[PDB]
Amino acid sequence: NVEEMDTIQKMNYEATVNMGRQDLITREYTFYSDYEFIPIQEDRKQQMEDALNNLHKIIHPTVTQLKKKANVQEIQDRVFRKLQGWEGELNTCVFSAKNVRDSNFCADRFTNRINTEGVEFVKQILREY
Amino acid sequence: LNQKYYTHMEHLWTVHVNRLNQKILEDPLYTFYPQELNVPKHNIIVPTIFRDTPQ
């Protein structure tokens, strides 16, 4: 702990803590004219992260067995075009969301698109390579 | 008027009948309700409590 560290170690620990505490300070300064939106809730965030992890699990054997960064980047570009269309849809539907029910509906739609259409599209792509 | 709006309304009515045949009784993609039929936006958005990351 802090009492068990020397002066330089205390300096390093304080440095790391302060560098981690950036966002906290920015929480005090908010702008009036900004367009507020209901953010994606934590459970929906975790579900979307799990969907992305599932996509990465599907992708991993092929890209790790690929020895060409050009091919890996091509796969990434195609999957990113698909996911970016879906992300644009999600952002459009979330920014206009009137409440957490609407935000959850949009996040669930995006996750289902990843889990249903995304996996099939990625599987076809990886079968191409 | 009949020429112009005949072609336009023919297309509109074709769309209407096509969406009736599929029993689609929801509202189309560009329906803007009056303020009495619109969901108000929730202003109160309390951010999550800041917490130092263990990692």
Partner: peptide, 28 residues
């Protein structure tokens, strides 16, 4: 736009429910 299904007031459906039983729309 896209009115969300839970936020979609099916006004058309309402007008379809008030429609008589013989109008061509019901045939459609």
């Amino acid at each position: 736009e896209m009115i969300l299904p839970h936020n979609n007031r099916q006004l058309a459906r309402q007008y379809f429910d008030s429609l008589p039983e013989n109008d061509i729309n019901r045939k459609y």
